[PDB]
Design a protein around this ligand. Structure first.
Ligand SMILES: COc1ccc(CCN(C)CCC[C@](C#N)(c2ccc(OC)c(OC)c2)C(C)C)cc1OC
Ligand SMILES: Nc1ncnc2c1ncn2[C@@H]1O[C@H](COP(=O)(O)OP(=O)(O)OP(=O)(O)O)[C@@H](O)[C@H]1O
Ligand SMILES: Nc1ncnc2c1ncn2[C@@H]1O[C@H](COP(=O)(O)OP(=O)(O)OP(=O)(O)O)[C@@H](O)[C@H]1O
Ligand SMILES: [Mg+2]
Ligand SMILES: [Mg+2]
Length: 1156
């Protein structure tokens, strides 16, 4: 698919113009470098009126700069405009094709997947075809023209440098590869801690219940230590990579200078040729290096566009836009289904359509009946030509549906949905979606007919009341009535309705049926319902039989047939922070920083040195003296580069280690704190949806690289850049003030250029995303509702709406492209103009003997290359912004304290528990929904060694009394006391330990069963004999013994490797491990291996002595086996007493007992 662009041949011309502009820019840059070589050559010749020659050279520079400006502007602007046009056209085509797809197609592919496809794949195509291609062409042109210039102006020096450059390229690529490998290794290493934390957090309730936080913390600490080791290895790898790159480039500089000095000293081509060839070839090498991102982006776009086109290329089986069918004018009611054989393509194996015979005459209110899953609604669905008949015949008025206008057919048949979908627009908007030619008079008549006026009239702008998100504005009965009105507005020839009002309420069903069946003489009707009333009104009713109709007759005929109809009838009855505070790594890295900065400063001083040293290697030739001594002097500088490069390397190496450790240590310590901080938190905190277990895990994981960068990387980059630029500026001022001042006041233009470019890129991205979302609202609202859309045959109208929503931001995109192109062209031409002005001024000074030409080169190179290196390093280190906000979030979380400090040693800790509990007036309001109280201040009490049972209502806090008993919260109002001990005053540790809570679905860590059982008895060692005794008590010791490896078996995740009953028994045994004085069990019986469940319940009862057990269950006999029972009614204790007294009374307990 090398040619994946297919739109607007004129756009092809625009793209070719952009390509030519890219070639021009690429050729231009080394052309500027060659002109620099010539200027240097003339400057050196002047070592003996020069100003004129300098002015001529400056004129050449200005011409090339203007050419560069125009060429870069053309490149970026033309490519971006072409991309905008291409993306607009392809997005329109893609949405239209999606609308064209078949119902089966949309069913097969996930709707969310396709919506995300539209949202993201097109944008990725744009990004990979927008401008990066222009950059690729420009880089290729720069490489080729650099080589051409090097060859033209030199043969030997060019050859040596071209033979050297691949070494540097290979070294850089190899270092990148090893860095990526180390990245993968570090990810895999930390995955262990990640899994540990995920398991712990997923079991936060049980984790806090068993007080095993310490063990999990220790394991996480060990994993974190391993991950820190690997991360430090990665950091040293990356830093040594950068150092090796610096060493290679400086070695290239040194060898180039040595060879060039050898040549020029030999009377060969002058120094200017050396400078031009060296710089041009080096720039070519770096550009061919920079080429890669464009290729990567284009490959990603290749893949995405391949998928998109494959979606587009698929010609559908049914083409709603195709008008190759016959469109009769007068439609006479006559429906024929003959041996309709077919199935759901989703699972073609089944055959729901097992052939069907049915003939309906005109003006018949036919109806279908049958058991759920008999395909009664599938017949109607096929009636709309939503699917195709695998083997059979379907026709209306004696003509095959396939041989008729698909769009016309679908618009000549009206349908009603059991759960109608309504377009998220005004009531008038919804009616228009139903049909635009309503004239608003028949619309009002239909609105009146459907009996939907109260909801419409009450709402603001009665006839134009909008529908909120997902139809929350109107009522379900209102929604059904609106749907019926919309269907009727089309005045179809065949109505197909299912569950008119059989979803939630029947009150509006009477009016709905009255209005629907009222006007059906000229509109044949198919009705699917689930109530006897709707069945009775049927005129001709057909019963379904395995996708076949056996019973066919009226109500009386069906009743006399004694079919399934009669069977049913009888059965029918972002806080901020301070950089000073954030530097917590002081406690750790204080011995580290002093090293790194010292190294970093040296590196900051390394680059400016290269300037002055380089300057001297030029100055040595500019001097008229030029004796043989220079041959020695050149060496004195040449080898320096080599040594200099080593220095450049060496510091980084050291800098890698120290800082690599400094950050790495933090990654450990911070984690070891934050996770702990998370554990020392109340259950309510986790209850917040924001603190989602997965989200908390990710934050615990995806923050090391953020905080490390914010603390260390930011400081290192700031010190390095500051040292480098300050050294350069100060040295320049020492050796020059005029050119120094001009350059210092000119560089900020470049700084503004770069900053504005980045800011414009970010802002344009955000704005484009915003407008794209504005259009995607319409797109998704017209994709998630695809079935009802095709039923409405309004696809074209939604296509026009999306076309408008895209035309709105298309112009904005084009204008943004133009603006970005102009800004980029200015940024690129600024450097050329600055070189022109700086060298013109340098001549204007040296001619007046104000500054040595060597001094001019010194100042220029120092300042400009310092700016370049500073920008590069700044763009190298991790971003401060995201790192800063991540540090803020983690600081907020770690510093945040709980309302109940489980680690607080103070608290009433009586030696022994009395087994007395009294919960009175305890009002429970969950922090998730504090406006929805769950406990109504119920009243209850249990004595020592007393077994109580609950009769709470569904989702009324029946089990919450254990939850509150678990101390996972605090009583909002009222009181709960244990053995006359203040629950608030009771130490959280002691209370949590002394209670044997049993959860409704007790989770277990995926480790050895021995550890899982042992972990319950925290704060002490539980001998294997105690574990065996507990397992026998829970009736699990025998099962474990039969299991190979006994208690050492690696229990599968969530206990999957073991039977659910086995897992519950293991959890009960663990609970019994702590020999709890007061215990709680919640829905532990269910059915649960009814024999095994009964055995477990019997064992628990046998071990109920010497402990008070609070039991919540759905088994009648277990509740009766309790010592006492407490009823619940909206959080109110209706009654409390024994089984006999409770049953005798008229209380809900008797009815519940009679239920089973
Ligand atoms: C990266 O793109 C460019 C590269 C070079 C140039 C101009 C001429 N260069 C020979 C000097 C600048 C590049 C420079 C060197 N040498 C350099 C850049 C990046 C580096 O990190 C990989 C580096 O150290 C290895 C050195 C100097 C900053 C010290 C302009 C550029 O902008 C287009
Ligand atoms: N996308 C689907 N792919 C496969 N089977 C499906 C799909 N949607 C529904 N089904 C099932 O296929 C059968 C089609 O039944 P259909 O609804 O058309 O008729 P019905 O007699 O009114 O039954 P029901 O209303 O209980 O589904 C049902 O068993 C339904 O659950
Ligand atoms: N952390 C929480 N935040 C908000 N609501 C909660 C929370 N935990 C439970 N609930 C709600 O409290 C009720 C659960 O209480 P409880 O389990 O004691 O009653 P239940 O009758 O045994 O429950 P179920 O009918 O679910 O088996 C449900 O409404 C549940 O939505
Ligand atoms: Mg159905
Ligand atoms: Mg419950």
């Amino acid at each position: 698919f090398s040619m994946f662009r297919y739109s607007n041949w004129l756009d092809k011309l625009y793209m070719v113009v952009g390509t030519l502009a890219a070639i021009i820019h690429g050729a231009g840059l080394p052309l500027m470098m060659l002109v620099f070589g010539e200027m240097t050559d003339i400057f050196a010749n002047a070592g003996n009126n020069l100003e004129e020659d300098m002015t001529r050279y400056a004129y050449y520079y200005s011409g090339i700069g203007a050419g560069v400006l125009v060429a870069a502007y053309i490149q970026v602007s033309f490519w971006c405009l072409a991309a905008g046009r291409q993306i607009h056209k392809i997005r329109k085509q893609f949405f239209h094709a999606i609308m064209r797809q078949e119902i089966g197609w949309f069913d097969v592919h996930d709707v969310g997947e396709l919506n995300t496809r539209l949202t993201d794949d097109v944008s990725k195509i744009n990004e990979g075809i927008g401008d990066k291609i222009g950059m690729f062409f420009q880089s290729m042109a720069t490489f080729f023209t650099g080589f051409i210039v090097g060859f033209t102006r030199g043969w030997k020096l060019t050859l040596v440098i071209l033979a050297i450059s691949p070494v540097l390229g290979l070294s850089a690529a190899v270092w990148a590869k090893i860095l990526s490998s180390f990245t993968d290794k570090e990810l895999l290493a930390y995955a262990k801690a990640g899994a540990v934390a995920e398991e712990v957090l997923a079991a936060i309730r049980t984790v806090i219940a068993f007080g095993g936080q310490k063990k999990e913390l220790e394991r996480y600490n060990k994993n974190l230590e391993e991950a820190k080791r690997i991360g430090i290895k990665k950091a040293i790898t990356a830093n040594i990579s950068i150092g090796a790159a610096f060493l290679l480039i400086y070695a290239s500089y040194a060898l180039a200078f040595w060879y060039g000095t050898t040549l020029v000293l030999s009377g060969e081509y002058s120094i200017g040729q050396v400078l031009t060839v060296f710089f041009s070839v080096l720039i070519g090498a770096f550009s061919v290096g920079q080429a890669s991102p464009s290729i990567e982006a284009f490959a990603n776009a290749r893949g995405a566009a391949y998928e998109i086109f494959k979606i587009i290329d698929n010609k559908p089986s049914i083409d709603s836009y195709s008008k190759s069918g016959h469109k009769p004018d007068n439609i006479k009611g006559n429906l024929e289904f003959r041996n309709v054989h077919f199935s759901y393509p989703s699972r073609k194996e089944v055959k729901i359509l097992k052939g069907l015979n049915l003939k309906v005459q005109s003006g018949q209110t036919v109806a279908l009946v049958g058991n759920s899953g008999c395909g009664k609604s599938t017949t109607v669905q096929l009636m709309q030509r939503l699917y195709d008949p695998t083997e059979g015949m379907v026709s209306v008025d004696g003509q095959d549906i396939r041989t008729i206008n698909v769009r016309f057919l679908r618009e000549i048949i009206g349908v009603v949905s059991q759960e109608p979908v309504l377009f998220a627009t005004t009531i008038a908007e919804n009616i228009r979606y139903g049909r635009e030619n309503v004239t608003m008079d028949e619309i009002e008549k239909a609105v009146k007919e459907a009996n939907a006026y109260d909801f419409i009239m009450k709402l603001p702008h009665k006839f134009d009341t909008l529908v909120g998100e997902r139809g929350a504005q109107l009522s379900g009965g209102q929604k059904q009535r609106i749907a019926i009105a919309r269907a009727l507005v089309r005045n179809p020839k065949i109505l197909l309705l299912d569950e008119a009002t059989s979803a939630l309420d029947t009150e509006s069903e009477a009016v709905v049926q009255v209005a629907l069946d009222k006007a059906r003489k000229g509109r044949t009707t198919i009705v699917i319902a689930h109530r006897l009333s709707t069945v009775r009104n049927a005129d001709v009713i057909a019963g379904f039989d395995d996708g076949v109709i056996v019973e066919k007759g009226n109500h009386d005929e069906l009743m006399k047939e004694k079919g399934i109809y009669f069977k049913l009838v009888t059965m029918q009855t972002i806080p901020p922070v301070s950089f000073w505070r954030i530097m917590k790594l002081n406690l750790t890295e204080w011995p580290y920083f002093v090293v790194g900065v010292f190294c970093a400063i040296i590196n900051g001083g390394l680059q400016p040195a290269f300037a002055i040293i380089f300057s001297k290697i030029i100055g040595v030739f500019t001097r008229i003296d030029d004796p043989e001594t220079k041959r020695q002097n050149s060496n004195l500088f040449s080898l320096l580069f080599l040594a200099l490069g080593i220095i450049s390397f060496i510091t980084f190496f050291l800098q890698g280690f120290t800082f690599g450790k400094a950050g790495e240590i933090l990654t450990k310590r911070l984690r070891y704190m934050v996770f702990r901080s998370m554990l020392r938190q109340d259950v309510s905190w986790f209850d917040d949806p924001k603190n989602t277990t997965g989200a908390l895990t990710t934050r615990l994981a995806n923050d090391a690289a953020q905080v490390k960068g914010a603390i260390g990387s930011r400081l290192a980059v700031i010190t390095q850049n500051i040292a480098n630029l300050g050294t350069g500026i100060i040295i320049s001022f020492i050796y020059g003030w005029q050119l120094t001042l001009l350059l210092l006041a000119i560089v900020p233009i470049i700084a503004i250029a770069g900053v504005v470019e980045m800011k414009m890129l970010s802002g344009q991205a955000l704005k484009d995303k915003k407008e794209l979302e504005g259009s995607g609202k319409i797109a998704t609202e017209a994709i998630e509702n695809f079935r009802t859309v095709v039923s409405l045959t309004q696809e074209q109208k939604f296509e026009h709406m999306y076309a408008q929503s895209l035309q709105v931001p298309y112009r904005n995109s084009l204008r943004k492209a133009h603006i970005f192109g102009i800004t980029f062209s200015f940024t690129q031409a600024m450097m050329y103009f600055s070189y022109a002005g700086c060298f013109r001024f340098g001549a204007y000074l040296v001619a007046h003997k104000l500054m040595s030409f060597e001094d001019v080169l010194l100042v220029f190179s120092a300042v400009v290359f310092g700016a370049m290196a500073v920008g590069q390093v700044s763009s190298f280190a991790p971003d401060y912004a995201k790192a800063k906000i991540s540090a803020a979030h983690i600081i907020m979380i770690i510093e945040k304290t709980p309302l109940i400090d489980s680690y607080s040693t103070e608290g009433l800790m009586p030696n022994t528990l009395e087994g007395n509990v009294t919960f009175g007036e305890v009002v429970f309001n969950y922090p998730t929904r504090p406006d929805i109280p769950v406990l109504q201040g119920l009243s209850l009490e249990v004595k020592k060694g007393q077994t109580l049972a609950l009769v709470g209502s569904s989702g009324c806090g029946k089990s919450t009394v254990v939850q509150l008993l678990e101390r996972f919260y605090d009583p909002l109002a009222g009181k709960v006391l244990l053995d006359g001990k203040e629950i608030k005053r009771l130490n959280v540790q002691w209370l949590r330990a002394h209670l044997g809570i049993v959860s409704q679905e007790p989770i277990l860590f995926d480790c050895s069963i021995a550890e899982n059982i042992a972990y319950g008895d925290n704060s002490r060692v539980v001998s294997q004999e105690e574990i065996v005794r507990a397992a026998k008590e829970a009736n699990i010791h025998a099962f474990i013994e039969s299991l190979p490896n006994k208690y050492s078996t690696k229990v599968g995740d969530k206990g999957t490797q073991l039977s659910g009953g086995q897992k519950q028994r293991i959890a009960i045994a663990r609970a019994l491990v702590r020999q709890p004085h007061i215990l709680l069990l919640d829905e532990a019986t269910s059915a649960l291996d009814t024999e095994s469940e009964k055995v477990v319940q019997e064992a628990l009862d046998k071990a109920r002595e010497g402990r008070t057990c609070i039991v919540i269950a759905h088994r009648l006999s277990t509740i009766q086996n309790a010592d006492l029972i407490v009823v619940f009614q909206n959080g109110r204790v209706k009654e409390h007493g024994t089984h006999q007294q409770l049953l005798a009374q008229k209380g809900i307990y008797f009815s519940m007992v009679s239920v089973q």
